[PDB]
Amino acid sequence: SRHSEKIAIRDFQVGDLVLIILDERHDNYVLFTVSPTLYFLHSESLPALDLKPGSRRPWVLGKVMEKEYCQAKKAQNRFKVPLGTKFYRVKAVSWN
Amino acid sequence: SRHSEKIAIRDFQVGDLVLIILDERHDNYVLFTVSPTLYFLHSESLPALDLKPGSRRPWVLGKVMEKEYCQAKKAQNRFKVPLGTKFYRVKAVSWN
Amino acid sequence: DSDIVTLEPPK
Amino acid sequence: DSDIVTLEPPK
Ligand SMILES: OCCOCCOCC(CO)(COCCO)COCCO
Ligand SMILES: OCCOCCOCC(CO)(COCCO)COCCO
């Protein structure tokens, strides 16, 4: 009986309910998606979601509040992606 | 711009849009879910979803049309679950 | 066919 | 901070 609990899985827009999951390969939280594009959770959003950086909560529901398209310009980078990867950084808040 | 493409992730009901994914540990398609309960795709549903039994499509969207609660009564069973596991079998059809 | 049994049919 | 660059800010 969860009429409202339906998540977006791609093409994320402000206001979408999303599942935020731990990605151990990139050592970061990401949006669950069917797309191959990566949507990393912005480090700013972790406190609002009761998540911690670096028991470790495997998923949380949130709402997208902002998205930014970015590119890795160093092979050593915060998201452990190959040089040149284009990806999104997403700020999300907790959901009711 | 996918207003309608929002999936249920637990407590599945008839009519829910769901993501059906390959589970290689159980060698079967399952509903993507945050619950630890398993929701296996019924073998009857594979043709309707353009899936094949046993390139192998990693996911497809579908709508739940029926769910049945079941228990494994043999340690060797079709879903590779431990003896005694209770789980659901779900019939789903393709989505628009 | 008897590897699994139905506990609760569809509601 | 320069490991990544912004290509497109939020719309
Ligand atoms: O991140 C992996 C790449 O994802 C893009 C393809 O989507 C795959 C999904 C969604 O991520 C993986 O499910 C595991 C997610 O935690 C669903 O597909 C099931 C394949 O068995
Ligand atoms: O099936 C594994 C058990 O699932 C129950 C917990 O949900 C875990 C999820 C959803 O299945 C796994 O994402 C991988 C799914 O393909 C989301 O959690 C992310 C943890 O990193």
Residue numbers in the entry:
A (entry chain A), B (entry chain A): 1490 to 1543, 1550 to 1591
C (entry chain B), D (entry chain B): 103 to 113
Question: What did the authors write?
Answer:
As a core molecular machinery in mammalian autophagy, the ULK complex is composed of a serine–threonine ULK1/2 kinase, ATG13, ATG101, and FIP200 (also named as RB1CC1), and functions as a master regulator in the initiation of autophagy under the nutrient deprivation condition by linking the upstream nutrient sensors with the downstream autophagy machines. The ULK complex initiates the autophagosome formation, and has recently been implicated in selective autophagy by interacting with autophagy receptors through its FIP200 subunit. Here, we discover that the interactions of FIP200 Claw domain with autophagy receptors CCPG1 and Optineurin can be regulated by the phosphorylation in their respective FIP200-binding regions. In all, our findings uncover a general and phosphoregulatable binding mode shared by many autophagy receptors to interact with FIP200 Claw for autophagosome biogenesis, and are valuable for further understanding the molecular mechanism of selective autophagy.
To test this hypothesis, we quantitatively measured the interactions of FIP200 Claw (residue 1490–1594) with a 13-residue synthetic phospho-CCPG1 FIR2 peptide (“SDDpSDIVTLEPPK”, referred to as p-CCPG1 FIR2) and an un-phosphorylated CCPG1 FIR2 counterpart using fluorescence spectroscopy, and found the p-CCPG1 FIR2 binds to FIP200 Claw domain (residues 1490–1594) with a much stronger affinity compared with that of the wild-type CCPG1 FIR2. Fortunately, using the purified FIP200(1490–1594) mixed with excess amount of p-CCPG1 FIR2 peptide, we successfully obtained high-quality crystals and solved the FIP200 Claw/p-CCPG1 FIR2 complex structure at 1.40 Å resolution. Further crystallographic symmetry analysis showed that the FIP200 Claw/p-CCPG1 FIR2 complex actually forms a symmetrical hetero-tetramer consisting of two p-CCPG1 FIR2 molecules and one FIP200 Claw dimer, in line with our analytical ultracentrifugation analysis. The clearly defined p-CCPG1 FIR2 in the complex structure contains 11 highly conserved residues (DpSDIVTLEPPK), and mainly forms a short β-strand that directly augments the C-terminal portion of the β4-strand of FIP200 Claw in an anti-parallel manner and at a location far away from the Claw dimerization interface. In the FIP200 Claw/p-CCPG1 FIR2 complex structure, the entire p-CCPG1 FIR2 packs extensively with a solvent-exposed concave groove formed by the β4 and β5 strands as well as the β4/β5 connecting loop that folds back to the β-sheet of FIP200 Claw, burying a total surface area of ~579 Å2.
